């Protein structure tokens, strides 16, 4: 997985070099690769991914597509702006709730 | 005799093109 | 004249359609 | 020689035909506008000497 | 202020053919007007029939955009002009090409015939014109003195006998059997891309986004301003009736008079139907033999063509 | 009125965009195959 | 379609019981539009 | 001075592509006094071409009109010159004219780009212009699926157990089907040596692996991005997925799970034919063997015609739904299964710099494709056969029949369907008319269809292989009923699902 | 017949010489024969 | 100062100017033409025959 | 095509040390970009 | 009652032209053996599939000739030299233990 310290030399790396240059950055890093390193910075260490909490219209929106478009994720989720695993779990979550 | 049979020509085909007749006919 | 350097829809037949379905 | 240039037809149907000799290309060399469709740069060598 | 000008009927689309996949960067005209020729950037060279518009035939010969095509009056030859360098000789009975003049160093940007004598002028960007014998092939002269892209030539019987406009802005008039430069226009401010000159009238214009100029022969004196039509200007045609059509590169076109300098019409067509708006723009025109259809080449690979219209006078529309 | 993307009509048609009287041609596939000369020869 | 009882009732309900719709619904120099949707097919064509 | 020739013409067009551009408007339609910057419009040009090329948006946000206009036309004029090339060159490599090894390789490239712009365009206008499938003919399919299943009596299938006694061997089977990949044991690469090192850890501790996989199929529905990349055959090209391994082993192992339960509860009825009893060759026995077999089948004396149609359909797995598909595959497996199947088709997908969202068909090169295409052409079966004639051939749930085979004659001879085989996608049919049967299609095909001009005659294709003594001899009758034939069996699938 | 380290590009591909060598060598006195069309003689070096 | 070297494309080749004849067009007949007349003559002609056509 | 006069590939160990102190480099580069005060890198390293 | 007439289809012959032609394409990093050993599997793969379509079909006895005899020429091509007397059947047919290439062929028949 991943640990604070690459965590950081990938934002480093990334802040420097650019965001479409994955292969140098896997090169800086010891035991990653590009694969990984584009996933990582795309669900979580991009500073547009934002993590706090839910406004209820944000919610009401997200139960109503989730019903429209039975198990898309990924086509979910742009169209409310967290990532595909935010809405899963989030959708889980109120499911749970009111179970 | 090029009775119509054989090739235009033998040139690119990989056979020298060589026609005969089926010897056993009848 | 100043130059400045280089460096979603959904329909609404989704919901009819899902829960026509559902029915 | 390598040759000059590079469907359906009436005349080539085979339940009109009568095959009593059957043609060859000395017929077709020695005759070439009665055996031959489209005969194009063609000489017409004859000799009775 | 000056006379008034003729009145001149006006222009109406009539026609719009397609079947071209690039710009259409040349157009010229049969001497016996059955047929014109286009030559384009999808780098093929076709001719049309010029009652119908349906196409003869399509000639692939060059390795880029042609970049001008023209014919000759005295012998059954096409000579077209391309940015790969080249300049072909196509022999019309044939259809084959059979004669090319080697020698340029960057892309020809236009060709032009003697109608007298057989010689060849082309206009290069880099930055020089060559005279080239039909027959043999060979350079006798290369006009050279401009500093930028020889945006385009013209070749009269009169003299001075041959005309560049360029890139560095100004105008030069040659002498043809000295090869060299007699005289030296720099009246206009922008690069000159256009330049004409009148059948009957010892007189010639050029034209740049600043405005068309009109000058006179042959020491190349200053006549008269033509303003309004302030885009770039690709094309300027003049008429045998003194109207000058001027053919802009934002698609416009304005029809003027030749004497008096007065802008006439004002057409701005439509793209066909895929295009985007900023591909409008016409690259050639050309008055036919009859000088009664006007054929324009465009940017979006349509030849449209324009007749005269017969049913409109001067109190349908009135001279202003 | 669902509109298959195989048809999906962006651009309006020439007719609609020249209007109904100037003619409009599209040539692509020409006639008059490679050999036959434009300009004659005599005998 | 009298295909069967299924969905003869299953459009009898969806045509009484089904209205319009919410979040979809609503979520359905120059400016740009051009350049954007000329280098990118995943937009709707303008051309002016 | 010399010529331009073969490998200076793309350095070529671009000398003088970027020359006219610095003629034309950088010096020509300035107004920008100071020193107009041509130097940066120029690298707009240059990034306006790489993004038209990935397929990105490209817009930068203060930059006058004319500048724009100047930039957009340039670029469309590069892409109309690199397209037309690569028309021509794929012309040129079909039929056999380069064996150049750089103009393969830069058309295969070329060409993967075009199809990705064309495929994004086509996800954007799914989820604009709504869902293809109006909510009649998605009820229609629904419903008619639930009645076959019905009255088949089929016995859906369940979650694999806890204590499920053949998980061992289905995940041997799965890796041993893997590993087949990387036979060779060539130089792979990074990936190949992690994905073979999954298959040996998971081959040395089972029980590790199938808590992992139950672990997945029961909590996961969003999953990595997958990549593509084309296989050219020279004559057309074949898209090949590149999915991540862990989900390749998760999905290995639910294809051989789904595959076992499915022939053991009889899902597929006998007609869906790339089935493992027999190859190809003896298929074609079959079919000759079954024909032959009818009864009176060579026989006219009365005016009968035989009619042998063979088509495909045209476009399945692009089409497919992902909707009505998550509802359709519900009907036969745990709710869980399902959805694992459904969110795993939906996926980034992605080559060297352009990315998209698969939203609208189906990823063909997941493991478990082949049992969601042979699910849905049976639904289409279905749409093609009706309930009765399919369930005629399918014979009575406690009794099934065998390929081409019915229970007596009577039923047989019930109905102009007499045979129909289904390959993957291919599908060929066997009728057999009667005189009136025959005449009464021609006339409800004229009256909606009407040829007055005798133009039917023309568009008929047949074999221009066997000589004219044997090839098919198009009279009115005959040319009639094989166009009638094929307009019935058109009408019968909506063009919203499938066509032909 | 005849029943890690780290390698730059053009050894990680471009053909082994070796197998073709070895078959010529196997095959040569038929394919290096005297009776030949056109060809200009040349002995081996020493 | 005149090179010495040379070129094969530069050999003697096409050494006559075929003249337009007087058949063809020659610049004599387009001396006289009227071509307004025979254009109209022509375009008439042509719609007559897309006409039959439809 | 590979070319000629070259020596051979870099092995594990001097991949490994270059690899270091390129990490160091992007170190002193981020610390320089952020300017810190509260930094010194010792005579061991 | 019937007999059933079979021929080798035509894109299946296009597609076997397509699988040499790719073979030729991908060998100039190949050893002879390799490139014979892709030529025998394409072949046994064409014909024990279809196996009596094609002695019926004379396109595909015309293909198979021009096709093992360009597989031939590249070896020859990969030697430096294409005379017919360097290179008698025998260095191609050879079976490998007695050294030669292995070549399996179907290319001298009479058409
Ligand atoms: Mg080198």
Redesign the interface.
Known sequence: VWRNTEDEILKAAVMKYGKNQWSRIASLLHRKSAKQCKARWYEWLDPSIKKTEWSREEEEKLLHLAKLMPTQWRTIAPIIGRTAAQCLEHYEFLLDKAA | ????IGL??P?????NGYVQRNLSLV | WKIPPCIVHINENFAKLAEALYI | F??LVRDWNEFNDINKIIIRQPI???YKIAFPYLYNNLPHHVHLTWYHT | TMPKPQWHPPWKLYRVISGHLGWVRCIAVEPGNQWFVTGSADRTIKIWDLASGKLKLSLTGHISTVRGVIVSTRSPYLFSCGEDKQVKCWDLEYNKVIRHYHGHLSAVYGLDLHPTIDVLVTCSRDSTARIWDVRTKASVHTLSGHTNAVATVRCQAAEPQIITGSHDTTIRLWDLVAGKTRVTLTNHKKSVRAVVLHPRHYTFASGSPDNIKQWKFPDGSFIQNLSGHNAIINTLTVNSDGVLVSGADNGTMHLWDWRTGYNFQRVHAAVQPGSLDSESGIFACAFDQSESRLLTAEADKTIKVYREDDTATEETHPVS | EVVLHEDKKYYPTAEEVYGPEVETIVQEEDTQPLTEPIIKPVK | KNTNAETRETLQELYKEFKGDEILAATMYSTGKVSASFTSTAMVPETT | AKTVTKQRVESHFDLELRAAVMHDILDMMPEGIKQNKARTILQHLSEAWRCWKANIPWKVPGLPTPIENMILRYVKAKADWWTNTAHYNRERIRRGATVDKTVCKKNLGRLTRLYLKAEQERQHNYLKDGPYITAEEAVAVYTTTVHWLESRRFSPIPFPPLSYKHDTKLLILALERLKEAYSVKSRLNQSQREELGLIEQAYDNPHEALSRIKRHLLTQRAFKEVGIEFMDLYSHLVPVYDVEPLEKITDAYLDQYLWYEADKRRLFPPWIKPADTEPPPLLVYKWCQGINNLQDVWETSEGECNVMLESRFEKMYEKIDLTLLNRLLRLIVDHNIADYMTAKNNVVINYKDMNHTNSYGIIRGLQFASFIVQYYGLVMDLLVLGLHRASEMAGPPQMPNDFLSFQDIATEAAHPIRLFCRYIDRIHIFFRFTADEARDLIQRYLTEHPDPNNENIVGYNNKKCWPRDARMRLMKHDVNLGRAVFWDIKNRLPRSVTTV | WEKWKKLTNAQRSGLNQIPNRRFTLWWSPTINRANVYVGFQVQLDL | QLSKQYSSRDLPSHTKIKYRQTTQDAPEEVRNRDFRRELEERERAAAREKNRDR | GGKTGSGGVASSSESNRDRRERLRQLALETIDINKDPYFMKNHLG | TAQCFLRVDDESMQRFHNRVRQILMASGSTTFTKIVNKWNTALIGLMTYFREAVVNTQELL?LL??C???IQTRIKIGLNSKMPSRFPPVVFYTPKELGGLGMLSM?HVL?
């Open positions: 005799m090029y009775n119509g235009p020509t040139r690119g085909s990989g056979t | 390598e040759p060859r290309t000395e | 015309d000739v021009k093992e005899n360009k290319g058409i």
